[PDB]
């Protein structure tokens, strides 16, 4: 199915988006234009390198408000957190519990979990600690999207080089439609184990089905109360 | 027929300027090299540190119309017709239109609304009249795609190169203009073709 | 007629006086906002302008929030700016990105006002459709009250030329009384439409 | 043997230096000056501490360019990375993931692995956290070359307290050609265990052997294909 099937999960939802310095980031507002229409408000918070590759003057003409680092209150603002891109610092900080920068520490002050879109090229994807940083936020509750493996251009070389890339914006919302329902399912009171990796299971299936399972997750959640 | 030329791609303060790194990308395998030349709202919209990851060279206002064989202004502003139609050159990008050899190819962007005024008519018109090219936008009305942009930078080129041939008559200057009004991939073919006619008529 | 107004400040000694204007306008139309150019500023601070208006959009959207842009005092260089195309503070740019037609009230010293390019840029801007509200011999701009006659009746009469279904008839007997009587431009022009949803 | 015995397997290589903040970083030139006769070209990297301790317009005079954080190709543009002097926070920060300055980043933006160069007075060198980073940066492939117990000056104390200082210039630049050889023949593809352990266990007890043994276990590569 596809990703404008679940909208209804999103319709009254407040979504933060934080920005990382990766060169992608300058391309940010095809995902941001793109979730317009379905959140009720939609905000960023950006790193300083994000800065200086997309000024944030130029990111507010695409959402409703801009946070700089020159804002405790926003992770409580936020009903979902998703960094994207994300960078391995980020990774690195958020994986730590090191929190130097206003994203990162929105991490820790968001009250559920977050959800991060990982780009970085294929060689820095490749190091061990990116990995090992990668399992551990998944081990402490967060998402990691993951990227997709294509040639795209490298900065650093002028030529075109293997690079881990964002999903398009259909598919990231599809991302975090179905991070809401995972997190909303799996955090349930009234379910037993087997009917909560039944609604995990088909989430993992069919994502464009994650608002049919949520809003029968919770129907089942009021009868067995 | 483009690999030997040089290209300037002067960048004026429109929103689209964010996405100006699809077109660099797109021309950077078609041209011998790639310049960018920017205003300073179009600095203070997208930074020319970032421009300059996609080109090799960004000339930021803090010779280059000389350095250049092809100079295209992309996206171009309702101010910078303004200022090139009436010979006005605030900006190094307006400034350039005039040390530049040859003419210049214009992308206009602008909302429908301001391209329906009629002063912007009218500059595109005297500019026009002036041997410069303004390629019309489409409806997605936005710019034309890095592909049709290509496109329309090498059928300019050819129409200008045909345009100047010496030893050459109306009619036959004519026929290879028509011919490339009606088949801009054929630019390489007729421009070739129009050279030997011409060194035959020398 | 309760429409937003966006007045334009250029860099003249009368924007000193401006708020005279800001008050006598606040007294007719609900919203009020102002754009400035950088010389303006210079005479008059934006933070001091704002006291008399709703907000003052500085140099340190616009266009399509206003339903009339007025320009008062316009320099002769935002004239000469305006007739050719050449947008290069916000006062120029948002003559473009104004959906319809900007009223402009030169103010200039009788040397400047007396130069060929000068009237030439006035022309241009008339036969663009712009409206220029003529200046008197003192070359100052005319009275508050005087001032919103003006603009009310420029909007009437843009209003009333681009009817689309209605004749040359109803639309002359429209525009001559409105030349008769500015104050009457409220009841016109809503006499105006309802005769035109009558004639779809 | 001695240092100036494997000099051929760095005559073409292009070498970055990254500079922490460590005092012993205002003498860095004794070491740029001698590496300068060896490589190819030397380009330097340095933090803001290093700044603030010797400017970077210093020790340009001792290379051929300075990068300072106010260039991510960088670790492309490097055959070697070396990181010398490296504080304890450069090993804290590169051994859980986290890229917070130019010289961090360029780690995990560098193709293969870093020689990190620690320098810290024996109080820091003894807490569990310094130790348990240089284990992890060993783990995961990087070389930390230590330092060596001396009776230095204490800049905190004005007096001669226990510090683990840098090896001389020459012991390092074995140290560099050992590595080297040590990431060269660890990743040449047609080779076997027995072997690869034959070549790793003699750069161990020789390292001016280097260049004599990467040359031939380059030949033996080729010869087995
Ligand atoms: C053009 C470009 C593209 C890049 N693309 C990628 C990519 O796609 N993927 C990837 O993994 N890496 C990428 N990097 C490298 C990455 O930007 C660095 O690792 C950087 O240090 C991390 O940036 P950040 O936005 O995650 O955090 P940042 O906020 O950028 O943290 C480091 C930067 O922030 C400033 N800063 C100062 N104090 C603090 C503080 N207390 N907390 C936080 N920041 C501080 C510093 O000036 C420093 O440059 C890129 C670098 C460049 C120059
Ligand atoms: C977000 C945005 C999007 C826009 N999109 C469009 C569009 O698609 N089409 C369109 O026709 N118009 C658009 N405009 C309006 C357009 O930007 C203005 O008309 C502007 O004057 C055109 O500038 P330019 O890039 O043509 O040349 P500019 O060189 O930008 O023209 C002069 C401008 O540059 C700045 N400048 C020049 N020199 C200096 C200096 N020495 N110091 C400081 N500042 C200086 C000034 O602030 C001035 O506004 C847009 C404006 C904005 C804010
Ligand atoms: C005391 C005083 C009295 C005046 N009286 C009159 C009068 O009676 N009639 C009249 O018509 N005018 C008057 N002017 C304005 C003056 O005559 C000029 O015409 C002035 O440039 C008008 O500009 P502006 O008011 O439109 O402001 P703006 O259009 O903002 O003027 C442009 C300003 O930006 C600066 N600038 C320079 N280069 C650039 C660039 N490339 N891009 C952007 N900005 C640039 C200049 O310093 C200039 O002041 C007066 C000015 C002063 C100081
Ligand atoms: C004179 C002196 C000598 C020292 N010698 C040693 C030593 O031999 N061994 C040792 O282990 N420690 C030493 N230290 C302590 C060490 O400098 C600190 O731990 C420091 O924070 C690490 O410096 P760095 O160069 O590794 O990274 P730094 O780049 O110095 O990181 C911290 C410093 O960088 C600046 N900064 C700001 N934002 C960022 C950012 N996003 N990323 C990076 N830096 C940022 C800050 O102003 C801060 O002071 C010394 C300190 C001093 C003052």
Not at 43 to 50: D, L, P, Y
Not at 151 to 161: L, N, S, V
């Amino acid at each position: 199915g596809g990703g404008s099937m679940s909208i209804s999960i999103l319709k009254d939802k407040k979504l933060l988006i934080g920005i990382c310095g990766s060169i992608s980031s300058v391309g940010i507002s095809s995902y941001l234009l793109y979730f317009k229409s379905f959140f009720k408000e939609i905000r960023v918070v950006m790193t300083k390198t994000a800065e200086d590759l997309i000024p944030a003057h130029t990111v507010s003409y695409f959402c409703d408000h801009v946070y700089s680092e020159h804002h405790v209150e926003i992770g409580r603002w936020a009903d979902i957190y998703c960094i994207i891109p994300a960078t391995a610092n980020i990774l690195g900080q958020t994986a730590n519990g090191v929190a130097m920068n206003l994203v990162a520490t929105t991490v820790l002050a968001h009250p559920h979990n977050t959800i991060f879109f990982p780009n970085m090229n294929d060689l820095m994807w490749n190091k061990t600690v990116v990995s090992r940083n990668i399992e551990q936020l998944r081990k402490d509750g967060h998402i990691v999207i993951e990227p997709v493996e294509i040639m795209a251009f490298e900065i650093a070389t002028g030529t075109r080089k293997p690079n881990r890339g964002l999903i398009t914006p259909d598919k990231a919302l599809l991302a975090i439609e179905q991070g809401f329902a995972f997190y909303e399912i799996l955090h349930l009171p009234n379910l037993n184990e087997e009917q909560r990796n039944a609604f995990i299971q088909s989430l993992k299936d069919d994502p464009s089905q994650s608002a049919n399972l949520l809003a029968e997750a919770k129907k089942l959640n009021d009868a067995q109360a």
